[PDB]
Model the fold of this input.
Amino acid sequence: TVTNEFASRFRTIVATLANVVNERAVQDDMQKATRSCTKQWLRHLETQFD
Amino acid sequence: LKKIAESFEDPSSIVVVLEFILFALFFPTEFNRIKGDIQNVLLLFFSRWY
Amino acid sequence: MLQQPTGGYTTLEQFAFTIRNDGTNATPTQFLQLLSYEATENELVKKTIPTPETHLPSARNVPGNVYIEDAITQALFGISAQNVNAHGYFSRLSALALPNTSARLGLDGVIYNSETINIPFYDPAAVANFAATYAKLGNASTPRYRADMIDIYAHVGLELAGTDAERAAGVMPVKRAKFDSWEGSLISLSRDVVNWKILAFLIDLCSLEGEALRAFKTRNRDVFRMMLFIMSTAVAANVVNRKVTKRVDRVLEYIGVNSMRTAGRTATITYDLSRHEFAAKFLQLTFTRWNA
Amino acid sequence: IPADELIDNLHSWMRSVHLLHVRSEDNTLRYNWMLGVYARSTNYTTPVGQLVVNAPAILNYSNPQDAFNSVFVALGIDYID
Amino acid sequence: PVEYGIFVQRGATYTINAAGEFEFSGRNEKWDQALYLSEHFPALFSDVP
Amino acid sequence: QVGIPKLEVDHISFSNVVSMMTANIRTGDDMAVERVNPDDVRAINIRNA
Done:
């Protein structure tokens, strides 16, 4: 009635990918920055997909 | 596959991975066709990330 | 389909191997009779050849009728073959390897994907026997399967220059070959050999068994030696001529030693490194079949 | 050099070295001493060096041969100097 | 330069284990603010002698 | 018997079989490709073999 299996699957997908971006070690400061900003963008794609 | 040159240095490179995942979901068949040519990209991503 | 006799296909006059020499189509044995040798202080001890890899390379999905005989012969004795491992078409032999395959090997040496009218072909059981090994020419390039390209040449020399005593012994002095020679003798020899229908000799080598096979090894030893001679000139560190009272003795040095030379020369056909890998593999498979 | 100057200066430089690594509870692992030292030595700007930085656990190994193999496959390179 | 050498060689940053002892990076690396939310702290402000 | 090579002997032969490429095979024509530059000049791996 409310849950849509597709958007939910994409939720777990973005969950995995954000966990992976977060588990990505880097040297550069800017790479550290984008490592954070990508998690936000991931979360945003998640809502858009929903 | 129209080829993608991605070294997967930046965390933002994860975009390309997601680009395939979406392609895998929205178009599973055409994906099955180009999947090895995707695997050539994803292997760079794996060797560089894991 | 050409039936295989109680002897090999080589028993047919249609498949006879000969090099042109002194104005006639001489049999290889009467060329090798001209050959003489000079032993040096260096020695050659033959080690056991490693068994060929079990794994048969997949033939790819190839619509065309691949010309496998021209590919192999030019790869070994060809005056200007290069990058022989790049196209990778030798793997196509594996298509023949299966029981009841729809493919046939033409006397032309082309591997048709299906039987076709007015094209004679070797008996598929025998060809399966031949493909079952020689498809392994397909992995000459792949790193996990490469043949040795140094030690194997010892065996080459042994089967060429080696006397029956040195051959039973398994050791010989590193002989330097020589023969009374016409202009360009080695190139013209190599081109006489390139036109050889070697698939016949290999099919008989891989399919014949017992007494028929042993009689084959005795009947064709000089043909084998001739191919070995062309290959050995390909690897010879140098090939000089010697003036000798209104005569010229061609001399290649040395038999049984692969110099791994790649830079070309007018005297003989030259191996690009790929040709070295291919030749080494071919020798591995062929000597393996030749000693059993 | 008097012992006391040498000993303590050596103690200082030995304290200075901090190899990158991942501790592990498995009883079969050994650190790839050579690769980790070479990695540190270049301030981790060599491709093998940054390979050690992003994944230090790669230095750990059981079977001695695969220790360098995993680096070759991971870097896609035919060898290392 | 020598002081900074030993310093930056100790590590630009550090974390705090469950034991509570500081463990340094051993690795020179510019601080970025994303790190502020993580387990890392800048090393100058550590006050470990 | 194999045929005698035409250069092996001094006789002149005025019919010969010249192989030649057809309109399909072409050589020396210019060739298009898609160059793609490294994303960042500083990320480029000058060093390791």
Remarks:
- Chain D touches chain A at residues 44, 50, 53-55 (CB under 8 Å).
- Helices of chain D lie at 3-16, 33-41, 47-54, 66-75.
- Residues 3-16 of chain D form the longest helix (14 residues).
- Residues 7 and 70 of chain D are 38 Å apart (CA to CA).
